[model samples]
Target: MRQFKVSHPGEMIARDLEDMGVSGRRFAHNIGVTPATVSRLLAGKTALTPSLSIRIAAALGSTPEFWLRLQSNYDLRQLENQIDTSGIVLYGE
Candidate 1:
């Protein structure tokens, strides 16, 4: 099973939402997700999914890749922590 990691990009997301004058509950409603999901996301407890990422990007006028990148980095970190460390090292050092 793949492990999941918490991420900090939610802070940026929250900032963007605030800048756009969007409420968390409203954003969740717009994205067709639960308010609790948005709350956890803003609290850095979950990663963004592709579908939700696209919705958020559309609502926020950002790119889906931006959210996807954040999710990818978070997932990579989780995967790295669960697998063998030796084989995962980069730079061939």
Candidate 2:
């Protein structure tokens, strides 16, 4: 049973920014990225890179690993839902 919805990392970030009373433009400026970049990220059009993760962590009081792991988990869940593994046989069965 799924205990939680599988969501894009951007969704969490957007919520965090909202809860913190930060505008996307202000966050983009603070993170040294363009507002369009932040907009795309919030819109779930882009993946989080290591550098971006570091900047986000620094600004948000979290660790870079945390952001990367969040992204990784989201990607993994998406892959599980989209990929077909039935054709691949086990090495020893």
For 4-92, candidate 2 gives per-residue lDDT tens digits of 78667777899999999999999999999999989988988899889999999889878999898888988888787688899999998
Candidate 1 local lDDT, 1-93, one digit each (tens): 654535566767898889989989998898888999899989878877788788888877679998888778776776865777776658776
TM-score of 1: 0.68
Candidate 1: what lDDT? 0.80
Give residue 4's lDDT in candidate 2 (0 to 100): 75
Which number leads on lDDT?
A: 2
Give Cα-based local distance difference scores for all models: 0.80, 0.88
What lDDT score is found at residue 11 in candidate 1? 63
Off by over 4 Å in 1: 1-7, 74-84, 87-93
Residue pairs clashing, model 2 = none
Clashes by residue pair, model 1: none
Worst ten-residue run, lDDT, model 2? 2-11
Top candidate by TM-score: 2
lDDT of 2 at 34: 93
